[PDB]
Design an enzyme around this catalytic site. Structure first.
Site, PDB file in Angstrom:
ATOM      1  N   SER B 505       0.859  -0.948  -0.005  1.00  0.00           N
ATOM      2  CA  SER B 505      -0.097   0.039   0.042  1.00  0.00           C
ATOM      3  C   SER B 505       0.952   1.094  -0.047  1.00  0.00           C
ATOM      4  CB  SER B 505      -1.043  -0.016   1.002  1.00  0.00           C
ATOM      5  OG  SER B 505      -2.078   0.695   0.988  1.00  0.00           O
ATOM      6  N   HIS B 620      -7.432  -5.723  -1.261  1.00  0.00           N
ATOM      7  CA  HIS B 620      -6.092  -5.242  -0.572  1.00  0.00           C
ATOM      8  C   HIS B 620      -5.710  -5.810   0.745  1.00  0.00           C
ATOM      9  CE1 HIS B 620      -3.808  -1.295  -0.236  1.00  0.00           C
ATOM     10  NE2 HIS B 620      -3.920  -1.348   1.139  1.00  0.00           N
TER      11      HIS B 620
END
Lengths: 649, 646, 649
Positions: B505, B620
């Site tokens: 990320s 994610h």
């Protein structure tokens, strides 16, 4: 607004009353009637199905333990000896019949077995270390799905209820409770019948036959099977040369003697089942002075599920058992030191199942006027009769004379005082009783304006061995006489019975007798023959008990020329040319007790004589349709009965 | 031989530790890893799956309460106030998420709800009369199965963890326990966030946004929703900002919330606020640290509740992240913050409490998550960890704001080993004292794991967070490379000739930024990365507000967009020479896969060795809670890339 | 009552006009629009689908040869050289794409191949002994169905038409006609582009790239592949070091020389495709004196299926080919000995496909006012225009000035004389032409009361190479000028066009330009941006041609810092803050030419400015939605166009 067959859908059905080891609780099975999928029902086709859960009572109103919403549900509850766990069998879709273990003080059940074909007959060892059960494990048979042939070399290959017998019989398995491990114990070559643990948990007693032929002749022995020791288990050891029928093994507390239910060799299937005490290969009769069979043999139609009747030792001298007496079923005690004593015997009631130990008793009780209820130590813990959706009526007794003494039957009348049709109903067996079981069908008939006449002719089972023997080798003589004498006595005793609007009906042997009677008198205005017999010769070849039934019941062997001619002279089809009575034929395609070829011959013969005839052919069902078939097909059967009666009266 | 990624399969994952009302019991969720269908497994393809059941302890070793063999299993246990029943949520095959009721004194659970799409978030009313929950009921959407178009008119239409947002949000329902009846309570137009019952059971407090635009800007208010009688919600706090963790005060009029008042934006530490008649005042004063767990770890599967709880009329229990740890603290109406249960070397990731007891999950860098009840551990989950865990050593670095810290986890032995610089995401989270199977596995396979909290991390005060505002790639990149240099100096076993840089990320952004600004590393692994801040603004499920809050930049304005391009690692991709593994999930809506595709194409155009692992279906959260087989594949690809380049 | 988008469902779509070897017959493909399953349609959801069959004419009205009732149908008819058989490809359910062989004199087709993934691109050898085709045979890829990751190591991994590229490219196979045997011929490591047999049937010429990187850069070579002899086939042999774009191999009758369509190594993708004669490694331009590209590059929306345009030698000196000239597509002949001559060139018509030999020619012809029809030797053999369900209207030409000379466009007006809205439509490419193709969309717009204005700005392809080059490296300058000047000239020339009710719309490059224009002027009342481009930097990384498109079109490499800044300055998203025009966004999820991230950024940005915006997101479809997508989604796209225009005018 008279009630109809769908009144059945209001009922819930109890079974398997299991008392706790400490005698203070009962766990049982209750089957309710629900849609196959209540989430997605078919708009055009209702699908009422049995769905069962486990129930528990400690003295008060029973409460549910499980909440099945799909599948057949949960069955076979078995207490762990410490009273803290219930083993049971769960059926839910692809989960065919898995062994579950439920902690009773809190938490959900854990699945113990993972077999493709599920398990059956779980029994804890008395010390709680093991659970014994049988299973065909993960064996697959794809012959039917592929369309391959079945090759038959064994004398018996079909069984009513089980359809086609497997190539390998179910093996006996052992669940090690402490180790949480499963292990095959004994894979029989023929099959395991009754099974009971020794009280010291050293092993089990099992009933098995020597070969398929001996099994077909109902000749069995008792074997001792100890717990396994090495990786290859020890083989069973023959422990009683019985060579006859045996079940209900009841090991004595001393761990060496045991009782069995059955008949000694020589005696055929007409002999009353009795209690025999076994000691070091020797046998002696245990229930002496008691001219009545062990077990429930009284008719009823509100029994769905398992109804245990295994005898139980209350102490070192006292063996508790059930017995059929003149249309009733009571509990009695057999004694090593003395005769038989009544334990709980209502001559107007039927105890259909029971479990017991030194601390308490649980049972299911019913009467001709009371739906089956569950009891614990004399206290009713269900409220199932209250669910019966219309008022029940009380039968009146009507007797008839025979050379052996007085026979009895009953008349159930509708309300009112007007003339009503008279229905002669004939019970099957023939060695069973009508009387004091609860019969939804009979109550419904009376609720719809019919007088129900039903009786126990010679051949019935609750009136002594001699009463049974009276018909040996000569069905269609004195049994037919008793039925028509009883019916005549009914017409004389109850003037409102309309002698111009009469019908005759029965199932199994009652189907045989309905065919025999219409072939020998034209007096009846309608007939309903259910799972009937018409051709005794073909029955011998097609029935799952044909290799021995006529031999025991009539002394006749269909495979021998002289005997076959006598069987043909006893066959209702020989006399079918005289039938003039409009006849409804009800039969199930998978009935292996009375194969459907029996009904097809009666149907064809009646057609050739232009006699009004109707043939309701149920798929998938078996002999047990009227007592435990799929709910929609029990409705259809009842609908067809009343439609035929309404057309002809 | 050295342990591999399949070591994950030995682990069982605890979640949702719910203390009983009398404080004497804890019920929690345990996920184990099994075949999707153990009856008919695929000979050619293993299918390990999470399967959860409920567990119970009264002080001793926990015992299982449910025994799911199919489906995802059982979750969300909730005590009835009388302590005799557990409500929970069951998912088993076609049964998506049914509300179940389990009596604890004996017997099996009964199914309470029958919705096609199941339910979520059950909460008993304190008086036991009701269970509130949300559901989309039986709503059906056949657009995807038929191949019809989706018409988009709303600003936000996707959300990570989920997929496409429904046209109607889940409605709030009410289960009448005594009447055994279900009833819709309130159908919101936008959506319901946090929810808590008033202590008198008269109704609930809920967080909602006014419209679609306000929701995209993370602006919410608190509403009072009474029980229905013949019912509409009424706004009681004009917050216009982020709020959750509603904790009604015992007096039935005041309540606390977690969040931030409107003003600076979401880079401000979340704090505790006491609400009284539309007025707010900060409750956790003198405590320059955010509320809640913001410490990295990879052994959290399921729900981790952190809702504040009043221990009495003056004391509010809450959790807070402090320098890579998460401790329990008490805020006081009359005073400041006091430590309640705070090990500076440990992480309390979830907790529940009342006036009679506390249950929690605790872990450290060396200790797998365990469940505790009133200080006593009731699980033995660390024992399942299939290889020895090792102890990290602390390494510091200097900045103009003071001392920064990080850690090095070394393998056994005394020989030289490669050095792996790992960068945590956020960027406003901490590395430190959470349990990281991935890091232990790296050390168990012969790598030195270096991981630190550069400026931008969240546990070191607001100033440490603010230092990177609007200028990612400056002092944060400096701190990471300063930290890494200090590691090589302090730990001679680290091989300065075999180094790699990796992160997920924001750590993926930083891995791309670093390789575009120095060639010092021999390998790079960039995970759910960011390469193009402009396109992120248009594609991310938070793109409409993330750069505005984090950088003060609006990608839809010309001058700001140029600044976002100057912050994009892709501007500097011409300098990358480092062999780079790219890991990304197709359904990542937080960092959309177009970010990885641009980096992949750019490196290919420069003939830089590159490999792109593209996971379907995952999002994610792959490294923390994805399907087990794809967590294995991700780790296998990490080590294969490191083995090739060292 | 004005016609709607469902007018499309009345049309039938011709493709692949294959003349017989003797020149006297044509076989072609006709796609009709039917329900997915006409036996069981969905009451709530219509499923209109393309279903194709083969048609045959010998000069008169064409007749069907096949009668597909399920599946996609039959395609790719190929004459056997003796004229007695048709090979074709059949798609029906689980039959993905089987090679069929149909005897024309009587009898049904036989299926020749049995591969799980079917076949494609069948070509007979000229002597009739072989049929070449490609197939992935029975290879299975279960990653998607299992949910496994895809590991990408290759520069290009997606293609607009085929979605995800396979790990192994389709292999070239050989069908031995006399032996009725199948055999793998060559399994390429990268892939086979164009393919043509030598005229002596000794083997094939194939186009391939050296590696994955060279392929991504559109650099290819030509290889000679002889027929196999031993068990392992001989490998291909490099025959032309071309290192550039090449297709349409046309072997010369002498069996040694051949022509190719493409561009030499130096030139990029903006260079006109031309004809090159190859002889022993030497190349020279064949279509000299002809400043126009080979092939059809004129817009239309009534092309479903394959449209062959391979050049054909009519004799030893004459090469027949098609070429795009000022919005038209004509047939021309190139000559070894001379220049280019017109063969069949209507400046108001488009020949979209053709086949030829020395005995005859078949083709498909259309105009701006004439639906595509099939011709054989000048004679129309279909009646498809008659199916067009509303009257077509004739456009009027409107010109504009540029420094390179006069540009042209057209106005299609509705009936009547009242004021009507003016729609500026921008074609994609940008190196294609508007003009004389048949466009159902434009005729429908005029039939619903809109004036359609569409033009060929600098950058279009039919007006010489210089006209193309004028926009090199500077999209958004002189091309935007030409478009708005043309539109201004339309408003001046046609007074009924309502200058207060204008809209701008376009697809692909037209989507880029629609976004560019609204970001640079607020004059339009509505905009519709279709498969758009908003961010040239992200396009370079996400598009299936991103590794080379901007390099050829703009001289810019998104992976280099200085170039990327120039690409950002050319990106419409930089200027989105100025957009005030209500914008409809139409995009397909599986568009790999212009990925949907392009549309998502424009949508988000417009939302951030509170500009009225609507985003229609089509699943499964790709870039080709408006020209050949699933019929229901072409309707929805058109419905959304008109709904947006109706709201804003």
């Amino acid at each position: 607004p008279a009630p109809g067959p769908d009144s059945l859908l209001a009922l819930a059905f109890p079974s398997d009353p299991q008392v706790s080891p400490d005698g203070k609780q009962v766990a049982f099975v209750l089957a309710q009637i629900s849609e196959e999928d209540p989430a997605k029902p078919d708009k055009d086709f209702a699908r009422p199905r049995y769905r069962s859960g486990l129930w528990l009572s400690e003295g008060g109103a029973a409460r549910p333990l499980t909440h099945a919403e799909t599948g057949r549900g949960d069955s076979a509850p078995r207490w762990s000896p410490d009273g803290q766990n219930l083993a049971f069998v769960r059926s839910a879709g692809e989960v065919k019949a898995a062994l579950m273990l439920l902690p009773l003080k809190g938490g959900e059940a854990r699945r113990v077995t993972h077999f493709k074909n599920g398990v059956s007959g779980p029994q804890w060892s008395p010390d709680g270390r093991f659970i014994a059960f049988t299973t065909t494990a993960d064996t697959e048979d794809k012959r039917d799905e592929r369309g391959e042939a079945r090759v038959l070399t064994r004398p018996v290959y079909r069984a009513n209820g089980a359809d086609w017998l497997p190539e390998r019989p179910a093996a006996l398995w052992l669940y090690d409770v402490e180790a949480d491990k499963l292990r095959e114990w004994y894979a029989p070559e023929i099959g395991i019948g009754a099974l009971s643990w020794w009280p010291d948990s050293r092993g089990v007693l099992i009933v098995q036959s020597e070969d398929e032929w001996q099994a077909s002749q109902w000749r069995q022995d008792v074997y001792d099977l100890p717990l396994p020791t090495a990786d290859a288990p020890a083989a069973p050891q023959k422990l009683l040369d019985w060579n006859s029928a045996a079940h209900g093994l009841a090991p004595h507390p001393d761990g060496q003697r045991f009782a069995l239910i059955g008949r000694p060799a020589g005696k055929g299937n007409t002999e009353h089942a009795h209690l025999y005490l076994i000691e070091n290969g020797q046998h002696r009769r245990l229930d002496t002075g008691h001219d009545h069979p062990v077990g429930d043999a009284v008719g009823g139609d509100c029994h769905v599920g398992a109804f245990p009747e295994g005898p139980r030792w209350l102490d070192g001298d006292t063996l508790l058992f059930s017995s059929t007496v003149r249309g009733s079923v009571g509990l009695f005690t057999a004694h090593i030191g003395g005769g038989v004593k009544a334990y709980d015997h209502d001559p107007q009631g039927v105890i259909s199942a029971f479990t017991a130990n030194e601390h308490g008793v649980a049972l299911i009780r019913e009467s001709a006027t009371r739906f089956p209820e569950v009891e614990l130590n004399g206290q009713r813990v269900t409220d199932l009769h209250a669910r019966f959706p219309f008022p029940v009526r009380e039968p009146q007794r009507v007797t008839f004379e025979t050379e052996l003494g007085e026979g009895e039957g009953w008349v159930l009348l509708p309300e009112g005082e007007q003339k009503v049709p008279a229905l002669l109903n004939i019970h099957g067996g023939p060695h069973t009783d009508y009387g004091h079981g609860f019969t939804h069908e009979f109550q419904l008939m009376a609720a719809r304006g019919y007088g129900v006449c039903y009786s126990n002719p010679r051949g019935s089972v609750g009136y002594g061995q001699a009463w049974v023997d009276a018909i040996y080798g000569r069905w269609g003589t004195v049994d037919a006489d008793d039925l028509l004498n009883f019916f005549d006595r009914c017409l004389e005793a109850v003037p409102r019975l309309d002698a111009a609007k009469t019908a005759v009906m029965g199932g199994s042997y009652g189907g045989f007798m309905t065919n025999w009677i219409t072939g020998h008198t034209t007096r009846f205005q309608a007939a309903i023959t259910d799972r009937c017999i018409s051709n005794l010769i073909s029955f011998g070849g097609t029935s799952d008990i044909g290799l021995r039934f006529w031999d025991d019941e009539l002394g006749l062997d269909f495979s021998r020329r002289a005997d076959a001619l006598k069987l043909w002279d006893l066959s209702p089809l020989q006399y079918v040319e005289n039938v003039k009575t409009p006849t409804l034929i009800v039969h199930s395609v998978l009935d292996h007790r009375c194969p459907v070829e029996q009904a097809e011959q009666w149907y064809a013969a009646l057609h050739k004589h232009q006699v009004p005839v109707r043939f309701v052919r149920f798929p998938e069902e078996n002999h047990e349709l009227s007592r435990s078939g799929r709910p929609d097909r029990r409705l259809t059967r009842l609908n067809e009965y009343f439609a035929w009666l309404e057309r002809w009266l």
